[PDB]
From a paper:
The sliding force is generated via cyclic interactions of myosin heads projecting from the thick filament with actin molecules on the thin filaments. Myosin head is an ATPase, and its ATP binding and hydrolysis regulates the cyclic association and dissociation of myosin with actin filament. Upon binding of MgATP, myosin hydrolyses ATP relatively quickly but the hydrolysis products ADP and Pi stay in the nucleotide-binding pocket, and therefore its ATPase cycle does not proceed until myosin head binds to actin filament. Here we report a cryoEM structure of the actomyosin rigour complex of rabbit skeletal muscle at 5.2 Å resolution.
The helical image analysis produced a well-defined 3D density map of the actomyosin rigour complex at 5.2 Å resolution (at a Fourier shell correlation of 0.143). The helical symmetry and axial repeat distance were refined and converged to a subunit rotation of −166.67° and an axial repeat of 27.6 Å. These are identical to those of F-actin23, indicating that subunit packing interactions of actin molecules are not affected by myosin head binding. Each myosin head interacts with two actin molecules along one of the two long strands of F-actin as described in the previous cryoEM studies. The tip of the helix–loop–helix structure (I532–H558) of myosin L50D binds to this site with conserved residues M541, F542 and P543. A mixture of charged and apolar residues of actin form hydrophobic interactions with those of CM loop of myosin U50D (M:Y412–A3:Y337/E334, M:V408–A3:A16/P27, M:K415–A3:P333). Two lysine residues of myosin are closely located to negative charges of actin N terminus (M:K638–A3:D1/E2, M:K639–A3:E4) and another pair of lysine residues are interacting with two actin residues (M:K642–A3:D24, M:K643–A3:D25), forming intimate electrostatic interactions. In the actomyosin rigour state, they move further away from P-loop by a distinctly larger movement of U50D than those seen in the rigour-like state, making the nucleotide-binding pocket between helices HF and HG-HH more widely open. Thus, our 5.2 Å resolution map suggests that the nucleotide-binding site of the skeletal muscle myosin might be more open in the rigour state than what has been described for other actomyosin structures or rigour-like states. Hence, this clash of CM loop appears to be the main cause of myosin dissociation from actin filament upon ATP binding.
Residue numbers in the entry:
A (entry chain A): 1 to 845
B (entry chain B): 25 to 170
C (entry chain C): 41 to 193
D (entry chain D), E (entry chain E): 1 to 375
Amino acid sequence: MSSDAEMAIFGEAAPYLRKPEKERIEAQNRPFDSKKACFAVDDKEMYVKGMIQSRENDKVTVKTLDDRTLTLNSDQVFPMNPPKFDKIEDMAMMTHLHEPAVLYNLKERYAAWMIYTYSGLFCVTVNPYKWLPVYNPEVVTAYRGKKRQEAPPHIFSISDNAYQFMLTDRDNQSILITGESGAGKTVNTKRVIQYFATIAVTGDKKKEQQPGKMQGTLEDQIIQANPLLEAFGNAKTVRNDNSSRFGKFIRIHFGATGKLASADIETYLLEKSRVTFQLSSERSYHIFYQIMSNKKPELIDLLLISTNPFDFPFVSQGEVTVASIDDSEELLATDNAIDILGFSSEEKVGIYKLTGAVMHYGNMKFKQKQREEQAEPDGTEVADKAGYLMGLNSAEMLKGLCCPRVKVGNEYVTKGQNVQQVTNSVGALAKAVYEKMFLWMVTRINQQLDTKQPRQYFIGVLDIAGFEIFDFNSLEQLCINFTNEKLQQFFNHHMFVLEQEEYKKEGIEWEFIDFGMDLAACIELIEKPMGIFSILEEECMFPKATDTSFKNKLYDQHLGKSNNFQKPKPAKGKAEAHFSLVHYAGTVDYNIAGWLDKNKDPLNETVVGLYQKSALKLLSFLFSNYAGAEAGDSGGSKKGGKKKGSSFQTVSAVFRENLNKLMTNLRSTHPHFVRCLIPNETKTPGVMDHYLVMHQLRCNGVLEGIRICRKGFPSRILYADFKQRYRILNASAIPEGQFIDSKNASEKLLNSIDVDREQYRFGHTKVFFKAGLLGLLEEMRDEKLVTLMTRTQALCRGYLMRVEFKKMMERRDSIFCIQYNIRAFMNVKHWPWMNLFFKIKPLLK
Amino acid sequence: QTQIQEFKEAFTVIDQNRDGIIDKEDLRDTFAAMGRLNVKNEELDAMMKEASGPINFTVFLTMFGEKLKGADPEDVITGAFKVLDPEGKGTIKKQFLEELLITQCDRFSQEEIKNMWAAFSPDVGGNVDYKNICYVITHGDAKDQE
Amino acid sequence: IKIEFSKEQQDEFKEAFLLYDRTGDSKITLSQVGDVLRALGTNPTNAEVKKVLGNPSNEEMNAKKIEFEQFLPMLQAISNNKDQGTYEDFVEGLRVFDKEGNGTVMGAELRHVLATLGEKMKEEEVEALMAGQEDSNGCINYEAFVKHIMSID
Amino acid sequence: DEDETTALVCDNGSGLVKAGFAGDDAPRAVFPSIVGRPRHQGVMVGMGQKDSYVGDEAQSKRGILTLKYPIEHGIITNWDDMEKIWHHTFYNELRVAPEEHPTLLTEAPLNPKANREKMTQIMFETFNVPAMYVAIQAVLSLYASGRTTGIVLDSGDGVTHNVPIYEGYALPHAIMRLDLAGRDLTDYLMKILTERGYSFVTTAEREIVRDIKEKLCYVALDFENEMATAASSSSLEKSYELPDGQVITIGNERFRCPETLFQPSFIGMESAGIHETTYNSIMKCDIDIRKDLYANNVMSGGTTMYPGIADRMQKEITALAPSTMKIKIIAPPERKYSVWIGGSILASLSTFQQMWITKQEYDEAGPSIVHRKCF
Amino acid sequence: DEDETTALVCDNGSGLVKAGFAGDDAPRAVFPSIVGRPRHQGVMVGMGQKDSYVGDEAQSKRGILTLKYPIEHGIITNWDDMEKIWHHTFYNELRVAPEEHPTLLTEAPLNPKANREKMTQIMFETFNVPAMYVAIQAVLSLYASGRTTGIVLDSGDGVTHNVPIYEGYALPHAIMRLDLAGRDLTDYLMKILTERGYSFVTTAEREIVRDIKEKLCYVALDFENEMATAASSSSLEKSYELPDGQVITIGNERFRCPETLFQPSFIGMESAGIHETTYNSIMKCDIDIRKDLYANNVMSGGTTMYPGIADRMQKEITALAPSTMKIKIIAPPERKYSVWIGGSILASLSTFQQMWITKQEYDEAGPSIVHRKCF
Ligand SMILES: Nc1ncnc2c1ncn2[C@@H]1O[C@H](COP(=O)(O)OP(=O)(O)O)[C@@H](O)[C@H]1O
Ligand SMILES: Nc1ncnc2c1ncn2[C@@H]1O[C@H](COP(=O)(O)OP(=O)(O)O)[C@@H](O)[C@H]1O
């Protein structure tokens, strides 16, 4: 019955979604006046709500819900959202965006045991630490085969509607997912996977059926893979004990019409730089440590090594180990992991050995103490072993390392090699082998993953970590910020299109530009020619140039030139950084240690040439990609990089490469965005750490989110809607009736209100409201609401008095007689005649 | 014509003077039957002087005129009181009644109320009985009660 | 501008009230004094508008009838009194079933415990002089009636 | 579609054009710079030859052809011939439609401004490049090397220079010129061999002897000692087959011909040998710097490719120079393409990218715009 | 957070700025006072030089660069150039933020009030020093010394003064000027070396002679005899290595140069040479005090660093002064930084701290405040 609620309040599926009718009803009319009640900035908590005693000038005097009087600042006070707002689903709806408003709403819901909120497109769900019935299959019944509007936020929705969409719209779709540990990020993946399972079978459409061979279902197909791959990838950054090194696009595709054809995996992002080097409380990928431990010892011997991570420089650069780990056990596990995915141990031997080969290449010295300039190998210990594992000729290999020979129309000798250079090839070597192995592995899963079932259109999923800010930002960070930016711009553009469409449709005038664009100046600074990136790269070329020279270049180009480009001042101590940027983003400061040095990618042709021979795996990897073929110099490319003049290409060029590729796809498909959170450090329900979320929001960009919303005319309603509630504010005689034509009356209220036109516009169907008009409106009804109350009470009072009245009048005449007659008496009793007359009468017969 | 024709009688019995005027001896002589004394000079005549010549009944009426001025019937009075008494014949509550005269509208004085009390204003049960008070005064009194 | 009739009509209602108080005119009854004849305006209007500092009682002052004369008109002349139609909308907000029933207690307690109150007897009495019954009571009806004033015809 | 394009870097050599795509480690194209038609032009039955392509074709074609070098001594004298050549580079060798690519041209030292301009007008008007640059060959080579500081000995085809450089600065005044280089030396070997009684006059023969110059020759540890040794010399008598099949002997000749660089007097140039010109170049600079210059002597050009050149370079300087001084001779291993690589750096230099001349600039200012304030 | 801060003591020298923090024994930062840019300015392939750092760089930089000295003769002629130097000291060398520290600058003898005034405004407006003082360089030197009575001979870079002090008071009238100091000597030495057939005109060549003056030069026991000995002298000939690698021998010049201080006639100064001026100064003072002056006179400044200076000076002085009268010559061990130290103290004078000039004073009075009724 009445209430904004459906089906069954009580039933358990409801409670995360619903709120019970009673709870809602109590919620909506708690006390509220906008005027005092507000938010004040609190040093510790973040913000706090409080109320205003007094005003004059810039300083305002205030009392808090810790009820001391501070005198804050005029701006510094934050107006709260009106009562109408509370318990609100979609924060955007909130008329007053303010952060303590932000705390209040989601905070309030969550304690409620309401996890989910809808923010515009976004569907936010908080982590109830406690178990919640939501998951039930009874609830599922409620969901499936329904539209998303129809129910409050839930996975089965997103899984379903998209499933439908793919069929109707006949397009791939995408979802992204964020979540740190304690998101519940993993479960939802389980949940969604099954979801695919549920419909993928369902159909209404026929797609090629077979009785089947099997090998495990998708979902398991993926899961089996995980542990090993994350053994080898995955690691502990100084921050993050277990943070995946890599970015996973896990592709589940379906047929046109929503059959599942099958799945495949693509991987991108390997910072190999870890491999050599680790800084501080950090270490390499798990495996290195693992191998060295004594699960494995047959393997260690194949390696020909003494198990002790200390012993070798390649390993030794950072710390030996981390808590909380056990390299050995993880070794046992990983060997197990390798089995489960189910290859064929020779390849294992195989995959081990060659990663191992890397290590040996780690051994060999560089010298022939640079006769005179050239560096030549020292020991040929490793080169032979090297030679052997590959089966390539050590006389050759050594030579190939010593002095690579290369080709052109004529072949040249790549003199090329130096003492300094060479090592920056051994490591690169290591990184390459590993990655080629990784890649070759992946394709294999696809062969397996290849199911029966056909596919046109897939949905799914992107995982890579959120925007980060560090005490010490660096090449890693800036890239991430770079990636986020364009992404965010991508988002801005998308909705910009839609709104104006809507505005056009209604026919209310739009003057704006794509929301993304405002940012563009910033990103451009990074991206475009003479950008920080570009400039850095060519600086790479000059053999001569140094940090400073790079420093001046940026300075000359940008400093002061853009507001964007700014710099940290020395403080005490505290920090040193070369310069700072202001991305959309909020500002960021970066520092140098590494980057040009970190930069240097050089390809060594002859090694690749040499490598082509002998051991079967090696030939394959080095020769090229898996079965397939390529092209040449005809018809390409853009100044794609190709060589870069000599010395192969740097990172920045490839970064351009990847991102462009990423963008190409994303804009291909219809985005949806989910953000999962963890409420506060100590894990309790209800609970809201004001600081944490706030930081989250800006990083989330959700606040940004909100900012765009400012840009246009947020609140929208039908006129008919507008009239019904509001009229009580300004009444007229004529009956609400539908007597008052919606158009006329609402015209009448507005103007008689004397809002300026600027605030709103009509509207065949809708009236377009700006910020705040509603805030005015709501407030006034609030004040209105009270007064009539008192006036009714006035009425009741009159009722009393009026009723008294007749009784009163009635008494008056009775009284009047009383007074005079007795008074008549007072004289009479004395006056002689009166007495006599009375006596005389009875005398009469 | 009641009352005055009624009076007319009262005047004539005593009269027998000539012609119909009730002059000093009439008054004194009435008393004898009456049969209470009667200050036979003076007082009786002073009674005359409120009037300007011999009376003659008509002036007897006119002299009276103050008497007419306040007084409503008999009936109507009861009447006014009745409005007072939610209950029965029971009748008017004492404590109500004092309060209604004394502090209320045209105030009875401290004494003024008292005179009434002292006359006692027949009452019993710690209350009042109006009808017997009217029996004395308005009815004129023609008793009360032995 | 009033006008003999009129103010004079106001006078004798006034006259009696004086007569009650003993015989002179408080100040205080004021609101009631010409609530009786018709303007709704309520305590805070009364209190400031002239009774005494809102006239908790005696014996702070005394009006008197004539001074009171112009009060009745100006302290009148607004208009926003209140009004059966407007009330309903107020009533309705509570009504919540739109049934034009309430919910009788809810109800008395609303106007009681809300806005200014509003004593219990007064509430209880009015509703059933007003005579609309409990399941559930047209708060709109009650208001519509009570507004209209108690007689009607 | 993001943006940005290649650069056509063709190094106009007095004998070889090398042309390439920017960002290439080395040129895709190297072919001779000659123009030449059948000298006899027999007629025949039919045609189907290309009159004066000279191309690569000429080389295999030896005996038939005449030769001409429009760019004979490094400056393009003949625009008509030159147009022939560039056309060849674009369409034939590179096969690349010029209009698409901004093209960087190299140019000789002391190319007349007019000369530079005539080049421009042709590129825009003839080839219809969207854009182009002209650059300096010596300058290009320095770029490839990446030496800020030190003095360079860049002996090429037909010129030899010593350029002391301090913080990227060629010091104009220091620079010494040498007429002598490969083209000359090539003749010298020719003439000397004829001394034996062999006759190598012809064009065909010149090509031949050049081949012998580049295979066989070397420079001595000590000229005088080597000569004396020559009498007992078992080694020198190395033999060379001719395409006709006859086999000739050389080996006194092997060293004598190169000795010319050191003692240019052989041919009859008064000029100082490179070793002393080097010394003179350094002296021309200020004292304080010279220490560095001794430290970094870098060799350049094709005619500095003779083995043991550096060791000898080492000894000679040591001989001239002060007791304490540190002397280092550094030579890049594929030094000859130092000029192209050279342009490659500059050409695919995207910060610098404005530096390319554009059509509008050509239109507004003229070709001279290339000349006058940029390259 | 007790309360009290440092003082930035910058000492503006005619050839060297010395600067550091007060309360330190010696200037942390000492760098050439010059301004200089590529005279030739070649161009090259790029950039990353600074237009007129001079600073430290220049000296290594010798051969490329030019010098200017804004503060050439001790008074700051060029403000714009001046501003940059202060920037360099603060930011580049000292790496301090001017905002945080009160700063003490020192100025030359006969510096105009206007000059102080320009200085002052630059400090406050440009730099944002909280506080500022301007110190009298000789005075600072006096401070550093510690001696109340006696008479001082300060010869640094470019002026040499004799200054009697009695009870802390520099008797103004007494004080003597000689333009000659050691810039001149540097100049003189260039001349003399040239006569041999050596040449040192240039800027680089300037520095070199200075090195030679400072390492080699000495003052003779007796000038006349010294010349006499030279002929058979065999020590005199010591050798110096030029950066060029060539080696000069410096026989007589070593003493010849400093002789000038004693005999100004060498350069062409009419001036009385140092000893005479000293004497002239004392006699200028009252007879009685002179006893004290004689006993305490006192060497300062870079140009008093020559070994042999003191012993001679007494020999000369005693000759001039009367029989019985007692003479002492005193020289502080690290005399040259005597100016910086003296400032270092008085900037660092906490008790005195009220002296320092404030932003408010600057606003109210103007910069003039520092000038008038204080420093
Ligand atoms: N290995 C070599 N040994 C000796 N001379 C060589 C060698 N390779 C090339 N040359 C010569 O170098 C000259 C070309 O050098 P280069 O630097 O390209 O000249 P330029 O730039 O003046 O055209 C030709 O005379 C050629 O014969
Ligand atoms: N050891 C030394 N022997 C001789 N002259 C010296 C010595 N050290 C410094 N000088 C000279 O002293 C001069 C600098 O002295 P200084 O007192 O700082 O001068 P000013 O204060 O006038 O700038 C320079 O001419 C310098 O060459």
